């Protein structure tokens, strides 16, 4: 569980004192990678590549390279290695709870069953019925997001408990009253309406909030509630971008399956060929930004309330 | 009654195309200052980033306000 | 009836829009200034801090007058 | 008719959206070259804020013309 | 009865907006001059102050057109 | 036909404010520069003051436009 | 059968505002080269007049074409 | 009668475009006309030349407006 | 009744994934045109720049994902 | 039969409106180029006015197809 | 009989519009390098001038297109 | 139900063009440095590659949503 | 029907016109860099064209729009 420190490493550093950053990035980061990344075509191309750094992590091998100037290969490798075959599992047991990703040609290949394919086991989500799937799920990720700042927060709270600066304790459980006085607000207008055990929610919530502002006149506090009423929702890109991946790969394969309908004598044959070429090349671009997006959100999100300022140590 | 989703739905595009552009139009010159500043600026790369990162919450409340009259609908 | 209430939410969506526009064009020169001063500002960071947290009230205006014409609806 | 005050809406949106707009973009080059003078003008910061805030008569202007057309409505 | 009043405010706002647009674009290279000016030239405060009131005449028109267009309304 | 009177009076709109924001793009770099050029140009004012005063012919001719047009309503 | 008019007199604005938008941006960079050239063109006084005056040819055409159309109304 | 109008906002139209494309081409051709006057007093009649060309576009988009009057 | 409703959602979600697009595009420029300046001795800082490049991609999410949602209406 | 005639025209209209927008735009920085490269190059004036002249082959296309749109009348 | 022509036309002229305007900016930003470049590159002049031929093949594209959907017609 | 499909066919238009704008203004100032670097980066060749290369992806997103829409004929 | 493939039309037209403003924005300064490089980068032509060559890829995505929008006519 320990060689996942590498990212955490050279930044985080601090002046000692805190706890929490090192075991929060394996239990996080890969799900959220895998949950983005639903191709099992492309997991298991990625475990292929992982293979082939193996075959140089078992040789010294430093293998430079022209362009980046890459030297620091040897020993960090492994670990890089053990990161990445930790996520591939991930990212294939969301790729089986998620759609299917090829060679599903619905319309008369169904490889797993649908109320448009009677016969075996229907697929659970399909991405069609959007109406209702993709709204349980979006309330899924923002559970997700809100409960992360909910841990973060806490921890500041448990920070300031033990050290005697504790007043900054006092405007950290001032931002788990803001969070709780804007939820209840949100339930009040987009939520179900009602406001029976709403009310209590949004007293308790704005008397913390005052009291926290009694404890002294932070002129900084007041608006960053905002930011961290948007850093909530930052965290819904996570759909949205294996969505975009998942129609990529849904509209390639439509588009062999027409090219090996109506020209199927011989538009097989090309269309292999184009439909696999055309998946590497989206994916040598797309993947690079797709693997850097979860752990940016993890960094700006979760490390900007207690260990990043430190001047590292 | 169709037409009403529509012309909500022309609204929801306006609003979260131009909170984009105006957040995208802030961050380019933001970060083209930034990225110079990173060569020989090498601590105040976290100044960079909370700079660069600070004006999202415009986009943030064009989704807001996109979202609640979603609701709306 | 209704044909109103998309008129009034794509009104919505065109005033935000446009506020988020222009304050974003507002924040892309004093960020951008305020970074570069920065190096031998590390003293003045609260100063630009404030300087470039100014301009962001136009967002207030906008979602209070996007809320009151839609508390309208 | 209830079309009527749907225009009136978009019109008002109008207005206040554009007149932020004017009020960014007045106010993007001044900050930018006081932001880049409090390194000496730190006696100048009483001018360099008043300078600043001069320009939001404008938005004033607009949401007061704002608020006489929703008492229209 | 309504139909005219929706367009009379659109284009009232319209005008108006476009006016606050214009002043704001020119206020940004007056003030950007302005204020560089003022760090020594203290005593020309007088001037440049004058020279940065002197485009509001053209939103002042719009103002009273818009005052015109309200009384039709 | 009140509708029409809504048609000539946005007409009435664009002309003025389209007439504005050209009057504001034609002051505001010859004003800049004029600002900058004052501390030598003590004398020079005078002039200064004549040129600044060539763009209003826009305004002036914009204004007359939406006059006659409202006389024609 | 005023369908016609309205649509005829915003004809007539949106060409006589475009013609000072761009009668503004062509003022506008000459003025600014010709405040800076006074300092050392006394001598060149008249010349610079006669190049600032010589755009306003566009806003006669517009006049005038603004003007056959309202004869036609 | 909705072509009468329909047709004058289209000749309009066209008008203000080309008005606004001289204007912008006029802007640069004098700004770097006048300033090269300092010198160029004996080179001021080459340098008109430049000035008079753009009027091209605005003369075609009359004509134009014109041709659109006369079908009206 | 249908035949205006969803060619109006869809020209609504058209002008907020190109409106995106567009904000991105822009961003993107200046980013990477500072970047490619600096990569001359930015060599070491190559992946330094990459990551700035990456920050605008997330003005695009948020425009197909109400696309997305507009999409499921229809 | 009133329908398609307006269409046309405002089409055409448009067509040759961008046309002139566009050589204007190359022309500004073609003749800017130009003029100052006379002050020496005045043997080399005869070889900068084809590069004045070439950019008026793309308005020959929009007059061409102005006028086989009036030919569709 | 009529809407389809008239919406037809003011698609190829939007189009040739669009793409003349493009064109144009183009040409702008290369023949003003071009130009500086030609009075000492008289030799390189054959060489510089093809870059200016280079942009034609989208306007070239605008035009067929026009053609081929007149022939739709 | 015709105007469905010219709706969502002008929408598709509308979205690859607009992403087609974006990214060409962002392979401008990519490339516009790399050519400039290229002359001492002969080495760096596949390093100024990348960078062209990676805001292509607009394009394939303006695709993907026009194919989708293409789909939902 | 006509008016369903006129609406078409404007979108085929407007798709590929926007695909070409891009392309030729970018391609204005790409060509920009390359003349100015090709003074002592005369054996660099080649790389020159190859990124020339780069931007006008962008158009064709426009181009295919149209052409299977014109087969869905």
Same mark, same amino acid.
Do not use: C
């Given at each position: 569980?320990?060689?996942?420190?590498?990212?955490?490493?050279?930044?985080?550093? $601090?002046?000692?004192?805190?706890?929490? $950053?090192?075991?929060?990035? &394996?239990?996080?980061?890969?799900?959220?990678?895998?949950?983005?990344?639903?191709?099992?075509?492309?997991?298991?191309?990625?475990? %292929?590549?992982?293979?082939?750094?193996?075959?140089?992590?078992?040789?010294?091998?430093?293998?430079?390279?022209? %362009?980046?100037?890459?030297? %620091?290969?040897?020993?960090?490798?492994?670990?890089?290695?053990?990161? %990445?075959?930790?996520?591939?599992?991930?990212? +294939?047991?969301?790729?089986?709870?998620?759609?299917?990703?090829?060679?599903?040609?619905?319309?008369?290949?169904?490889?797993?069953?649908?109320?448009?394919? $009677?016969?075996?086991?229907?697929?659970?989500?399909?991405?069609?019925?959007?109406?209702?799937?993709?709204?349980?799920?979006?309330?899924?990720?923002?559970?997700?997001?809100?409960?992360? +700042?909910?841990?973060?927060?806490?921890?500041?709270?448990?920070?300031? @408990?033990?050290?005697?600066?504790?007043?900054?304790?006092?405007?950290?459980?001032?931002?788990?009253?803001?969070?709780?006085?804007?939820?209840?607000?949100?339930?009040?207008?987009?939520?179900?309406? *009602?406001?029976?055990?709403?009310?209590?929610?949004?007293?308790?919530?704005?008397?913390?909030?005052?009291?926290?502002?009694?404890?002294?006149?932070?002129?900084?506090?007041?608006?960053?509630?905002?930011? *961290?009423?948007?850093?909530?929702?930052?965290?819904?890109?996570?759909?949205?971008?294996?969505?975009?991946?998942?129609?990529?790969?849904?509209? @390639?394969?439509?588009?062999?399956?027409?090219?090996?309908?109506?020209?199927? @004598?011989?538009?097989?044959?090309?269309?292999? @060929?184009?439909?696999? +070429?055309?998946?590497?090349?989206?994916?040598?671009? =797309?993947?690079?930004?797709?693997?850097? *997006? &979860?752990?940016?959100?993890?960094?700006?999100?979760?490390? =900007?309330?207690?260990?990043?300022?430190?001047?590292?140590? | !009654? !169709?037409?009403?989703?529509?012309?909500?739905?022309?609204?929801?595009?306006?609003?979260? !195309?131009?909170?984009?552009?105006?957040?995208?139009?802030?961050?380019?010159?933001?970060?083209?200052?930034?990225?110079?500043?990173?060569?020989?600026?090498?601590?105040?790369? !976290?100044?960079?980033?909370?700079?660069?990162?600070?004006?999202?919450?415009?986009?943030?409340?064009?989704?807001?306000?996109?979202?609640?009259?979603?609701?709306?609908?």
């Amino acid at each position: 569980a320990k060689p996942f420190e590498l990212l955490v490493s050279f930044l985080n550093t $601090p002046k000692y004192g805190t706890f929490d $950053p090192t075991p929060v990035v &394996p239990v996080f980061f890969p799900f959220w990678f895998g949950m983005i990344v639903g191709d099992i075509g492309y997991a298991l191309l990625f475990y %292929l590549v992982g293979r082939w750094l193996s075959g140089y992590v078992k040789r010294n091998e430093p293998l430079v390279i022209d %362009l980046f100037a890459l030297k %620091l290969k040897p020993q960090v490798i492994g670990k890089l290695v053990h990161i %990445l075959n930790w996520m591939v599992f991930w990212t +294939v047991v969301w790729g089986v709870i998620y759609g299917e990703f090829f060679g599903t040609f619905l319309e008369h290949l169904g490889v797993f069953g649908t109320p448009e394919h $009677p016969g075996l086991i229907p697929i659970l989500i399909h991405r069609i019925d959007t109406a209702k799937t993709a709204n349980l799920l979006i309330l899924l990720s923002v559970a997700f997001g809100v409960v992360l +700042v909910f841990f973060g927060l806490a921890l500041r709270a448990y920070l300031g @408990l033990k050290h005697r600066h504790m007043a900054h304790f006092w405007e950290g459980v001032g931002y788990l009253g803001g969070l709780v006085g804007v939820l209840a607000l949100a339930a009040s207008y987009l939520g179900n309406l *009602q406001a029976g055990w709403l009310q209590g929610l949004m007293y308790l919530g704005f008397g913390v909030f005052l009291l926290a502002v009694l404890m002294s006149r932070i002129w900084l506090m007041i608006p960053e509630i905002f930011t *961290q009423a948007g850093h909530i929702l930052s965290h819904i890109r996570i759909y949205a971008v294996g969505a975009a991946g998942g129609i990529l790969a849904g509209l @390639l394969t439509d588009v062999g399956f027409a090219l090996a309908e109506r020209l199927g @004598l011989l538009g097989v044959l090309l269309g292999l @060929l184009v439909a696999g +070429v055309l998946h590497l090349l989206i994916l040598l671009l =797309t993947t690079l930004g797709h693997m850097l *997006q &979860p752990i940016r959100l993890l960094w700006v999100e979760f490390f =900007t309330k207690f260990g990043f300022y430190e001047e590292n140590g | !009654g !169709g037409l009403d989703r529509g012309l909500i739905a022309v609204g929801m595009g306006l609003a979260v !195309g131009l909170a984009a552009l105006g957040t995208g139009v802030a961050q380019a010159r933001i970060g083209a200052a930034g990225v110079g500043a990173i060569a020989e600026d090498r601590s105040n790369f !976290g100044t960079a980033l909370i700079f660069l990162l600070l004006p999202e919450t415009l986009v943030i409340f064009g989704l807001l306000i996109a979202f609640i009259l979603n609701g709306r609908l």
